[PDB]
């Protein structure tokens, strides 16, 4: 059911701009989520009072008919691995359509995602220039408090 990175429908990261996130920690800025770089991450704030849900909004250079994104978890640490998510899209960054929710498989020990690479998330084709990705449950030294993402990969035309 899933496309892979080499699909003709995979959008280049240059077509993406992170325009908002609930919070950002350290130098793990929102833009790091869509820079095509597996080594950089967006990470939400992780002070004692910080908690879920958190979200990040990606703006595309124009509207696309989207039907998949891949979530790439942090490569060097499980901190912020997203295990339950929501996807919303819009044409105007104001009026959102709820596209889907879902879960990502966790490893046996329950400390990291089972798939440490690109985790595909499919959905019925929807025309969108903005996508809001919300982390509802996450893993970490403390679970369910902060989220991270190394990449979000978009598929559409
Ligand atoms: O407490 C959460 C923090 O833990 C650190 O070990 C990590 O480098 C940070 O990115 C953040 O995840
Ligand atoms: Ca990155």
Residue numbers in the entry: 6 to 162
Per the authors:
As part of the secreted C. perfringens CAZyme arsenal, the bacterium possesses an open reading frame coding for a 220-kDa family 31 glycoside hydrolase (locus tag CPF_1301 in strain ATCC 13124) with predicted α-glucosidase activity, which will be hereafter referred to as CpGH31. In addition to the N-terminal glycoside hydrolase family 31 catalytic module, CpGH31 comprises two fibronectin-type III modules, three CBM32s, a putative cohesin module, and a bacterial immunoglobulin-like 2 module. Though the putative CBMs, referred to as CBM32-1, CBM32-2, CBM32-3, themselves are not closely related at the amino acid sequence level, a primary structure comparison indicates that they all belong to CBM family 32, an observation that is supported by their overall similar structures as determined by X-ray crystallography. Each CpGH31 CBM32 structure comprised the β-sandwich topology characteristic of this CBM family with a short α-helix and a calcium ion capping one side of each module.
The molecular determinants of galacto-specific sugar recognition displayed by CpGH31 CBM32-3 were revealed by the X-ray crystal structures of this protein module in its apo-, galactose-bound, and GalNAc-bound states, which were determined to 1.58 Å, 1.48 Å and 2.50 Å resolution, respectively. The galactose and GalNAc residues were well-ordered in the crystal structures of the CBM32-3:Gal and CBM32-3:GalNAc complexes, respectively, and provided clear electron density, allowing for monosaccharide modeling into each structure. The galactose and GalNAc coordinating amino acid residues of CBM32-3 were conserved, and included Tyr1674, His1671, Arg1702, Asn1707 and Tyr1774. The b-face of both sugars formed CH-π interactions with Tyr1674, while a secondary aromatic residue, Tyr1774, whose side chain is perpendicular to that of Tyr1674, mediated additional hydrophobic interactions with the C6 group of each sugar. Galactose and GalNAc binding was further stabilized through a series of polar contacts formed between the side chains of His1671, Arg1702 and Asn1707 and the C2-C3-C4-C5 edge of each sugar. Specifically, hydrogen bonds were observed between Asn1707 and the O4 hydroxyl and endocyclic oxygen, His1671 and the O4 hydroxyl, and Arg1702 and the O3 and O4 hydroxyl and 2-acetamido groups. The C6 of galactose is well-positioned to interact with the hydrophobic region formed by the adjacent side chains of Tyr1774 and Tyr1674, leaving the C1 of the sugar directed toward the solvent, which would allow for the binding of the β1-4-coordinated dissacharide LacNAc at this position. Although this residue is not conserved in CpGH31 CBM32-3, the side chain of Asp1769 is similarly positioned in an adjacent loop and could form hydrogen bond contact LacNAc. Alignment of the three CBM32-3 structures revealed minimal sugar—induced structural changes (backbone r.m.s.d < 0.22 Å) and only subtle differences in B-factors associated with the variable loops were also observed.
